[PDB]
């Protein structure tokens, strides 16, 4: 069958492999949208996750399951699915721990084109379609359904992490995609002020959408400073990191009030380290939490993200600003991530 | 100082009253804008807190400092502030333990129209201003405002103490003004589904506004069973208790799932038990938690929710059905509370 | 295969039965040491869960895995093993909510001698070997160890749902088995004050071993005026309710501070309703919390557990106050304990 | 007065100074015990809070109280109290924002030998009283109450922060006075397994007293390694950083399980970056939560402690290896603190 992978580090091409089977609890699905993340990027050009041979990339896709085990008892072919990026394996310690994204180990609950072949196939395997898969409403449209799998499951955990009250003052570092669901989520935890640090055309106006009160543009003055002098010397109350380098946390740490929480969703693709300012962290005596986690994943996430969309307490379509068709054109979708210009915030390929 | 005060149980009546002087760390207010509560109502003539004699009734006010004493740093003559119904003395063990409206003593926090002179006075003492006043921007309407004080800071504490998880159902029992912040707050926590219950049409209208997705009534007999049948026997994950009487306790935990919470924010006056209801408590052991709690007060929550008007997260001023004008239509406010017409939600008057 | 059975309410004796086999996942195990609860009692001869035919009695064992389904990875034929009270179906939503407890339903987490036949029988049947299993080292005594699956987890439990603070006061009500691993799960969690309500005297002299700074007697029924005296008048931080009647809600409610929390490890099986004392619950704003839930199971708590007795955090042997030898004296210890001698907390049958 | 008194960046000694007056809420008090702490030594030697000059040193102290202002009810001259070393201002913000040790700005809440005379003196000033001290019981020895301003409050909100589940296991890095309040505070929590890592024999017998089960230390090469080693590639669930410079930060995360948290309680100065490794921390993605705080004050937490040693949940009376009589041997102690002996870890002068 024909699918995009990664050949190796820096190298991308469409290969041929075997169309896979379903284990008893297993369903094989085929997409019927699909979409490339800067995290495809940051592994195969950067190798922010080591090296990988002939791995099919792409881990966001919206579905039709076309085969299931024989143990399935949810989902039979024909099914529309939202494919969380995440499947887990359900029967681990990490499950029991309550951190299935680790299940199986650190990071281990992200398997497509992390650990296994990605949507980017004619077809793809879900290991526990009763556990890992959502029906798909056919109210929500494809391009919409397909920000769910990752970049709302991501921002909105960016809220969760961030244990927002209400009325609190909160900067989103980063308005991409995830960023912007960041800004969505924070403000359905009932942030006060939001502040979104970006540039993008684009996407200043997407955050606005979103419920962003202030947009901060690297261009006129540092962040702190531009966020400290918004405050009157005090700062926020929450910092949701979703973009940049990894001197965002040092910005997120000067920015934010003694006592705070630090939210990072954002994957770190470079460099051995990342800095904390000691004297803004108050020499690590500041109570300002830093806290960090990858999306989460299965069925029930996905059941509630749709919930959100299906009763309009958010509209992801927004964040999709390119729609293309045909398998041809994932390459396109995904080399566009790659040299990520003015005007993309999330390309969506749809096919036939 | 002339007043409108509870003489007695079923007792009111205009009368005259030594006008106040601050302590150090005290304001004396004058009220810009008050409205009264259904707890007034309950507090006079169904006797909820018991007798009382003399006392200048109210607790929701918006203001302007007239006078503070030698140590108040934060807030002058001629401030419009936000005034919490609750002004705890903030040097406590309770506060110690993170409780300040229990500071010295169950629900002591809340002192206006319980142990002190409330705000139906042509001035009234506001103790520890700097702890207890928030300042009011000119941009929010003195209508808006005047919500904050008690049915916002209340409703909103009902989807906090609730827990909300991103996506979860939610029931807000009783849909007058504290329910209608209640659906409110819950929304703003990230709620999906959420259903009211309750039937006046006036009501009903404001319950969608502020995010309602269903909406329910006894008018059906049984409120449960409707509940179930919304949701496909499987319950809510979360109920709010906003308004009617105790059998309300029992319908909570038998419409919400095990592991669920329930979350009192309506103070039970008469002397209607509260049954939990045993088999659907799952005997005690089916993780349903239960909740119930005085709103906070003081300078914080009030700077907070005011953002929340401030940045349009919320408009409160769907609240206001009436507004009346004049310190002494007070009493016409007062008695349009007592005999709640069916276009009533919350009355204001706004003093010259 | 032979096996200690309930044959109908109020009767009970040996049976004969096809010994059961295991599914892929499953495990047979054969007990080597078992103890019975209260709850065998109640089921039986006041029909606490309902008619049961036929159905094996008995939930805590220590046990030896005779044989696996072909999917079980972890565990062998001769492992020697902890079985956990709760063994849920771990592949459900209940489980992705966070609550094994209920993965399938209302406590239903619970199947020993509830679903299925229970622990007295030649051998009996795990589900989920995997996923409800702990290896049991050598160093721990059998009579140590059967304490784990149920008594230990529970009562800490009770300690857990209560989020005890650090130096906090704590009253155990009931100072049986349960209320005894509440006490020693409330120190565990540092609490400094620690009141047992009981009278008994060997659970006296054990609850003192386990961490009762003091013990009280119901006078004639009453503790609350009891519980206030011995702290002048603030009452306690904490209530753990771990045995006796609906009627200890009241008690406490009554002797918790605003603000407080109540944990409810007790099963309650008698009476339609348990009743919220309203004076003392601050009419429902006194924010006391009450809290109620099944033990943890699953390998991962019972992993915990032992290892708390491993490393002699708490020593369980003293709950074991009479061992018989030898599989035919269930019925003997099943006996004492619907006889509860003054001398007894928990009887041990050892196999192995 | 007498004081002993940082001088200048490196320069210490006796100076004269007119005795403190009370404010109306606060008291004077004269010390009966004192003891130095290793942030004094940084305090004056490496500028670690910047220039200072004539100011009394010593944040650790029990006293008698001689005089009290016109508004302190519940301390009058002649009491034995406690004195915290943070002894904020409890009318602010952050008290609302729960976070009284950053009341006034970050790290505010400490007070002594920073910005105002610390204890070494033959009196010192303790601001608000009622809030701030705690009356001290006769049964607990002077040596023995001294560590609790601190060492304890501040090795427990280590475990505390760190968010200890019943049987998980700690790693405490660094076993000086404050890592040994750590490793206490663990158990105390409901840790299972308690790893040690440090090398000073008085410090090593201590960690095993106070509950470590395991005891590593560098010299034996990487710390990493060898705790995998001992926990067979699995890490463990919890680290406290409570000493050593800050690549302990590094080891710390590499060491931790995704979802684990790291608390840490050591304050860092000087020339070392706080450095989080990028692959370990899973990209910024394995949920591994760092914390890191002042220690709690205020009259509630020296209660609880207090509380903790009354009734037997700890003894730091081991923390204390040396006892000098003698005002004038603080200086002696001082220096002790300064140059650290291999059998140092607590010392304390006890006054007449
Ligand atoms: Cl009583
Ligand atoms: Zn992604
Ligand atoms: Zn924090
Ligand atoms: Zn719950
Ligand atoms: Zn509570
Ligand atoms: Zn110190
Ligand atoms: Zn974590």
Redesign the interface.
Known sequence: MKGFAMLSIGKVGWIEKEKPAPGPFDAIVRPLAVAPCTSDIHTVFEG??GERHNMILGHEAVGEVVEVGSEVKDFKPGDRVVVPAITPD??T???????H??SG???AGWKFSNVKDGVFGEFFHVN?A??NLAHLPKEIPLEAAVMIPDMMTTG?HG??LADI?????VVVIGIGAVGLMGIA?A????????IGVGSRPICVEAAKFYGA?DILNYKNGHIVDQVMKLTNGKGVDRVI?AGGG?ET?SQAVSMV???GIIS??????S????????VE??????????????CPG????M??????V??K?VDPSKLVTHVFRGFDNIEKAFMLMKDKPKDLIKPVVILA
Chains 1, 2, 3, 4 share one sequence.
């Open positions: 922010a996750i359900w029967r310690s990490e499950v029991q721990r309550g951190y994204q680790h180990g650190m990071l526990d009763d556990m909105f809220a969760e009250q209400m009325g609190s003052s989520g403000k359905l935890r009932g942030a006060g002020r939001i009160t990191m990894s946390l009030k003694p006592g990072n969703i954002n994957y770190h693709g460099g051995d380290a990342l800095l904390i300012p000691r962290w108050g020499c690590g005596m500041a109570h300002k939490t830093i806290k960090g986690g990858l299965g069925r029930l996430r059941e509630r993200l749709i919930d959100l299906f009763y307490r």
